[PDB]
Structure formats: structure tokens, C-alpha cells
């Protein structure tokens, strides 16, 4: 088996991490007690990718829960699938991070990281052939952003040839009013550009807009936002969890999706997205499903792909449907929109199909785009960053932990360089 080790850090990381395990547990027929009660052998064929098998035919998620305060993880343990997680895989401090990237990365987080590595090492030693890791965290807080990126580099040091994958939640003033989030995000992006192989950009800006504009929820909660995240995380991991030919493991996905090492930030998308009040007069068709998954409104990052070009794209269709029709519609969307795909990467769109649909839906489409339009997200963060850094506002929180302004300037330049590089390849031509 090709095992993946999953880590979730901080409040956001554990919240979305718990939902991910609830959703895929239901998909694989695993109940809250770890027992299998599914009705399809496709559920268990690659179950070992994410689950260990213990005595009594129990399935235990290969998951590690990390935080600098007990609050969120205590509620996870009390959640629906709380008892499914291995009790010894809960690692938490007491001091907390206080939304301070420096405390998570250099101070409190550094005091706890070794105990986290001890658990990571135990999970990896019992792996037939470890693929790599996936981390869920936010970039706007302290623990997930600061200690999460610290865990990334420490794990990188011990597993340098394994794939490092993250689900990183980008901050937005529409969701949180914490003023220092642009600082924490920019410092985190600084680390992610260097130390991860692929990053799903889960943009709270886009999640809010989808809930408010599309789902017509006047007062979106974090639970509402996390429903989109868990549905997206299920979709983008389908090819890893079920028998499949395309992008069936973390490394093949990276080889297909990352043409240049630094440009490994993906724009996720999902279809269909409809509100409870909207009546579905007719079942969704493959053309409508394909066209919807390529629309800006269905993107989990607040970026319009029609403002840039696609370097690479991975599409996954779930449910029973005509493969001939999927093929025709995927050719159609590429031919009709050839201007938005770089000409110097031929056949840069790959399509996977899984028979098992998500819970509650007859058909779904999941979208993974490596678009130069992702620069809009980083431009948004850089603008909020410099609006505070040019005044040197709130820097004492971080300088008091030992940091200096030089590290802020370097993270700012590295993120600004990432934007310039996306534009470079957006404007490049074949002739």
C-alpha cells in the first residue's frame, strides 16, 4: 500500500480536518467506531492509503491532531467521529498561539514540534511504502500558519524525498476581522513556496461569496464554509482513495500539475453548487456539469481563470455517466476556450472518472487548476500586507518573539516574486 500521513494543526486545521475524515469515512463505509459496514469492494480496495487496520478489523485514520491549545481538539474528540482517531495521536500544548505566527513557528510551536515528530515517526514506521503527507491548516492564525509551516520543514528534513501536500485556508476580511492575518499569511506563503510540493488554496473569500451569493446564506457560519471545504477535499483526493488510472498518487499528480517547482498553488473547484431553496427541475447534464466546474463562481479561490492562463488542469467526474460524453465535453471546453490554456504545454488537461459519487449527489465534478490567475489571490494578500508593513503596524508582536523586520521584507519579496513569475509564464508564447 501507498500510505498517506495526515496532519491537522490549529483551530481551522482541526475543524476542516475533522470534517474531511467524517466525509471520507462515510464514503468508505467506516462508522464512528472504525468498523466497516459498506456495500462495495471499491470502498476497501485502497483503504490503507488513509486508514490503518488494527485488531478486530478496526480502521483507524492515519491522522495526527496538533494544536497549542486544547479547546478545538477537545471538541473534535467529542465530535461525531471523535472516538475514531487514535488517542495517542492528539498532541497539544496549553499556552496557545494568540494568532501570532512567530509564537507558532519560533516560540510555543518550537517547544511542541518534537513531540509531534515523535508521533509522525511512529505512523511512518508502520507504513508499507509511505507516499507523503497532507496538512490542513489556516494561514491567518498562529498555530496552523506558524507551527504548521514549521512542521512542514521539520518533516521535510526527515523525509526529503516524500511528497508534501497541504490544504491551506487563505484569510479574508469577509470572514475574520483579526488585523494581523495578512502578516501571518505572507510569512506562511514564504515557507510554502519553498517547502511544499502542492498546495490547495482554500480561500475564505471564495467560500464566503459562494455561501452568500450562490447558496443565499445571509449569515454564513464556519460550518457552512467547512461544508464546501470538506466537499472539495473529498473531490481532490478521490483519485488517491479509489481504483484509478490517472493521478492515482501524490507524486504522479505533482508530475502532471507542477511544471515549475515554485508554481505549485492550485485553484480548487466543485460542481454542482446550488442552494437548498433552488429547485432542480431536471437532473444535471454532463455539459452543464463541465461548464459549471470551469466557471469562476465555482472556484474555491477568489480568482477568475479568464484573467490568466491554465498551465495544467486535473478534472475528476464522480458518479454514473457517459464516459463518451465526458470525453466530448472536455474536448469541447478546451477547444472553445483554447486562449486560456498555454500552448507550450500540449494536452495539459487530464480527466479522471470514479463510479462512486459523493454523498447525496448523483453526479459531481471536481476541478484542480494550476492557473496564472492565482496571482490575484497573492496580490490581494500583498496589498493588505504592505498597507500595514509600510507603517510597521503591530510588528512588536513579532519582533518581541525574536524576529526582525528583515524577515518580513524577505517574505514580502518572495511572494511578490511568485506573482511576477506567474505573469511571466502567462505572457510567454510558443513562437
Amino acid at each position: 500500500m501507498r500510505e498517506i500521513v495526515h496532519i491537522q494543526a490549529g483551530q481551522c486545521g482541526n475543524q476542516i480536518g475533522a470534517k474531511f475524515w467524517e466525509v471520507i469515512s462515510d464514503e468508505h463505509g467506516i462508522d464512528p467506531t472504525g468498523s466497516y459496514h459498506g456495500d462495495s469492494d471499491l470502498q476497501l480496495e485502497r483503504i490503507n492509503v488513509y486508514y490503518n487496520e488494527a485488531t478486530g478489523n478496526k480502521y483507524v485514520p492515519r491522522a495526527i491532531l496538533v494544536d497549542l491549545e486544547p479547546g478545538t481538539m477537545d471538541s473534535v474528540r467529542s465530535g461525531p467521529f471523535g472516538q475514531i482517531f487514535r488517542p495517542d495521536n492528539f498532541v497539544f500544548g496549553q499556552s496557545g498561539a494568540g494568532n501570532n505566527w512567530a509564537k507558532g513557528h519560533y516560540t510555543e510551536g518550537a517547544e511542541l514540534v518534537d513531540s509531534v515528530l515523535d508521533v509522525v515517526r511512529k505512523e511512518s514506521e508502520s507504513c508499507d511504502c509511505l507516499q507523503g503527507f497532507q496538512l490542513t491548516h489556516s494561514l491567518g492564525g498562529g498555530t496552523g500558519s506558524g507551527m504548521g509551516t514549521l512542521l512542514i520543514s521539520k518533516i521535510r528534513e526527515e523525509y526529503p524525498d516524500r511528497i508534501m501536500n497541504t490544504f491551506s485556508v487563505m484569510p479574508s476580511p469577509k470572514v475574520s476581522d483579526t488585523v494581523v492575518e495578512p502578516y501571518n499569511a505572507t510569512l506562511s506563503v514564504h515557507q510554502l513556496v519553498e517547502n511544499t510540493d502542492e498546495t490547495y488554496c482554500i480561500d475564505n473569500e471564495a467560500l464566503y461569496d459562494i455561501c452568500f451569493r450562490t447558496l443565499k446564506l445571509t449569515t454564513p457560519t464556519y460550518g457552512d464554509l467547512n461544508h464546501l471545504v470538506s466537499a472539495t477535499m473529498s473531490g481532490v483526493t478521490t483519485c488517491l482513495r479509489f481504483p484509478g488510472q490517472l493521478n492515482a498518487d501524490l507524486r504522479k499528480l505533482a508530475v502532471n500539475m507542477v511544471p515549475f517547482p515554485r508554481l505549485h498553488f492550485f485553484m480548487p473547484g466543485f460542481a454542482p453548487l446550488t442552494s437548498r431553496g433552488s429547485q432542480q427541475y431536471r437532473a444535471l447534464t454532463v455539459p452543464e456539469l463541465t461548464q459549471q466546474m470551469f466557471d469562476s463562481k465555482n472556484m474555491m479561490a477568489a480568482c477568475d481563470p479568464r484573467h490568466g492562463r491554465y498551465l495544467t488542469v486535473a478534472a475528476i467526474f464522480r458518479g454514473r455517466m457517459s464516459m463518451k460524453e465526458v470525453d466530448e465535453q472536455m474536448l469541447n471546453v478546451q477547444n472553445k476556450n483554447s486562449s486560456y490554456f498555454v500552448e507550450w504545454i500540449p494536452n495539459n488537461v487530464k480527466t479522471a472518472v470514479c463510479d462512486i459519487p459523493p454523498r447525496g449527489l448523483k453526479m459531481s465534478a471536481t476541478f484542480i487548476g494550476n492557473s496564472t490567475a492565482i496571482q490575484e489571490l497573492f496580490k490581494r494578500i500583498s496589498e493588505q500586507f504592505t498597507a500595514m508593513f509600510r507603517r510597521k503596524a503591530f510588528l512588536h508582536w513579532y519582533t518581541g518573539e525574536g524576529m526582525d523586520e528583515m524577515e518580513f521584507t524577505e517574505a514580502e519579496s518572495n511572494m511578490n516574486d511568485l506573482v511576477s513569475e506567474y505573469q511571466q509564464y502567462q505572457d510567454a508564447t510558443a513562437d
Binding site: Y106, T107, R156, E157, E194, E401, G402, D404
Partner: protein, 69 residues
């Protein structure tokens, strides 16, 4: 004519042995060059991670200097 016959077959043997020898040497050179290259890439990566750890110690060391003041 017998002398020529001997030279022909010895020539055939020599060129086959030289093809084998060339192929063996080329593969040994490529596999050694590849091993050194991949090892160098990993070494550079780990050395960048070590510099980060060094910088981390410097940050914590810098916090003590200002907390004592």
C-alpha cells in the same frame, strides 16, 4: 584465403566485444553521474533546511537578549 577467413571472424568477435565493453562503460558512467547529481540535490535541500534551523536558534537567542534588558 585462410588468413583472411581468420581475420574476418576475429574482426566479428572484436566488434561484438567492443560493443559490449562500450555499453557497459557508458552505463557505469551514467549511473555514477546520476547518483552524484541526485545526492547533490538532496544535500542542497537539507543544507537550506539546516540554515533555517540555525536562523530559528538565532531568533530565540535574540528574544532572550531583549527580555533580559
Amino acid at each position: 584465403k585462410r588468413e583472411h577467413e581468420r581475420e574476418v571472424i576475429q574482426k566479428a568477435i572484436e566488434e561484438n566485444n567492443n560493443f559490449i565493453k562500450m555499453a557497459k562503460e557508458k552505463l557505469a558512467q551514467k549511473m555514477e553521474s546520476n547518483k552524484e547529481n541526485r545526492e547533490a540535490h538532496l544535500a542542497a535541500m537539507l543544507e537550506r533546511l539546516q540554515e533555517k534551523d540555525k536562523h530559528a536558534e538565532e531568533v530565540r537567542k535574540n528574544k532572550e537578549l531583549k527580555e533580559e534588558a
